[PDB]
Amino acid sequence: VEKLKTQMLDQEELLASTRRDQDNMQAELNRLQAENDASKEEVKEVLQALEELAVNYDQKSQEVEDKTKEYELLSDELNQKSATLASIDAELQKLKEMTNHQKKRAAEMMASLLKDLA
Amino acid sequence: VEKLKTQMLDQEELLASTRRDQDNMQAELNRLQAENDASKEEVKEVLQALEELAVNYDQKSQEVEDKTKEYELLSDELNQKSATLASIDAELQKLKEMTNHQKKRAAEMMASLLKDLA
C-alpha cells in the first residue's frame, strides 16, 4: 500500500499541474476576448464617426455648389452692368457732340451778325 | 455791338456750365466703371476659390469612403476573430472534460487496487 499511495500522490500532483495550465489558458483566452470586444467597439464608433463625415462633407460640397450658381449669376449681372455703363459712356459722348454743334452754331450766328457794315 | 457781346458772354458762360456738368458725369461714370471692374475681379477670384473647395470637399468625401471600406473589412475580421476565440473556448472545455475523465479513471483504478483483501 505504501507504493500505491506514492503513486496516487504523483498522479494528483500531475493532474493538479494540468489544472493550472488549463487555467492559464482559460484566463489568457478570456483576456483575448476582452481585448477583442474592445477593438470591436472602437470600430463601431469609428464607423459612426466616418458616416457623419460622409454626410458632413457631402452637404458642404453642395453648399459649395449653391454658392457657385449664386456667384455666377452675380458674375453675369456685373458683366451686364458693364454694358450699361459702356452704353452710357456712349450717350455721354453724343451729348458732348451735341453741345459742340450748338457751340459752333451760336458762334457762326454771332460772326454773321458782326458782319454789319455801317 | 455792345449788346451782342453781352449776349456772346452769357452764351459762353452757359456753354461752359454745360461743359462742367458733362465732366462731372464723365468722371462719375468712369469711377463707376472702376468700382465695377473691381467687383468683376473679386467674383472671378471667389469663383476660383469656390472651385477649389468643390475639388477639395470632393476628394475628402472619397477619402472618407476609402476609410470606410477599410474599417469595414477590419470590422468583419474582428467579428471572425470573435468566432475563433469562441471556438477555442469550446476546445478548452473539452480538454477540461478530457482530463476530468482521466481523473475519474485513475481514481477508480486506485480504489479497485486498494480492494486487496489480505
Side-chain angles (χ1 to χ4, degrees):
Chain A
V1 283
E2 286 265 314
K3 286 164 225 158
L4 280 208
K5 299 203 158 255
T6 279
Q7 204 196 238
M8 200 41 198
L9 217 75
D10 307 357
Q11 280 177 354
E12 299 204 350
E13 84 154 349
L14 286 110
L15 300 172
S17 158
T18 279
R19 219 80 220 203
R20 173 205 96 232
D21 300 337
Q22 263 153 29
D23 289 337
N24 305 351
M25 280 177 262
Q26 181 66 260
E28 212 216 338
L29 160 72
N30 283 333
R31 158 202 95 103
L32 280 193
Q33 299 217 260
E35 157 175 340
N36 200 50
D37 294 49
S39 310
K40 248 166 95 160
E41 295 285 276
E42 310 193 19
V43 295
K44 176 187 171 193
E45 288 193 333
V46 174
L47 275 188
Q48 268 136 23
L50 281 182
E51 223 276 336
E52 304 301 68
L53 263 50
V55 153
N56 212 305
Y57 286 114
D58 184 54
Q59 75 179 226
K60 297 260 162 264
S61 78
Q62 205 133 35
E63 289 158 11
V64 165
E65 197 208 1
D66 273 325
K67 269 314 163 192
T68 287
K69 58 206 134 162
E70 154 150 28
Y71 275 76
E72 254 152 20
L73 302 192
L74 171 42
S75 176
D76 281 353
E77 211 294 341
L78 294 175
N79 279 301
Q80 266 291 353
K81 184 152 224 154
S82 267
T84 304
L85 299 160
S87 178
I88 296 151
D89 212 359
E91 307 193 48
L92 194 32
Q93 300 332 296
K94 265 307 168 181
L95 295 157
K96 284 182 210 174
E97 211 190 325
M98 286 170 25
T99 71
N100 274 336
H101 183 261
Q102 262 147 8
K103 189 166 85 84
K104 201 213 64 204
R105 245 209 291 181
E108 292 172 347
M109 163 73 32
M110 182 58 39
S112 177
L113 296 175
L114 285 207
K115 248 175 40 166
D116 51 354
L117 315 105
Chain B
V1 283
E2 286 265 314
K3 286 164 225 158
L4 280 208
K5 299 203 158 255
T6 279
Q7 204 196 238
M8 200 41 198
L9 217 75
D10 307 357
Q11 280 177 354
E12 299 204 350
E13 84 154 349
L14 286 110
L15 300 172
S17 158
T18 279
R19 219 80 220 203
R20 173 205 96 232
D21 300 337
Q22 263 153 29
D23 289 337
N24 305 351
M25 280 177 262
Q26 181 66 260
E28 212 216 338
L29 160 72
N30 283 333
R31 158 202 95 103
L32 280 193
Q33 299 217 260
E35 157 175 340
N36 200 50
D37 294 49
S39 310
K40 248 166 95 160
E41 295 285 276
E42 310 193 19
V43 295
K44 176 187 171 193
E45 288 193 333
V46 174
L47 275 188
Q48 268 136 23
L50 281 182
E51 223 276 336
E52 304 301 68
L53 263 50
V55 153
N56 212 305
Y57 286 114
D58 184 54
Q59 75 179 226
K60 297 260 162 264
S61 78
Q62 205 133 35
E63 289 158 11
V64 165
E65 197 208 1
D66 273 325
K67 269 314 163 192
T68 287
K69 58 206 134 162
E70 154 150 28
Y71 275 76
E72 254 152 20
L73 302 192
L74 171 42
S75 176
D76 281 353
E77 211 294 341
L78 294 175
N79 279 301
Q80 266 291 353
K81 184 152 224 154
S82 267
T84 304
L85 299 160
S87 178
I88 296 151
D89 212 359
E91 307 193 48
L92 194 32
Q93 300 332 296
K94 265 307 168 181
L95 295 157
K96 284 182 210 174
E97 211 190 325
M98 286 170 25
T99 71
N100 274 336
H101 183 261
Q102 262 147 8
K103 189 166 85 84
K104 201 213 64 204
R105 245 209 291 181
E108 292 172 347
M109 163 73 32
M110 182 58 39
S112 177
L113 296 175
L114 285 207
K115 248 175 40 166
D116 51 354
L117 315 105

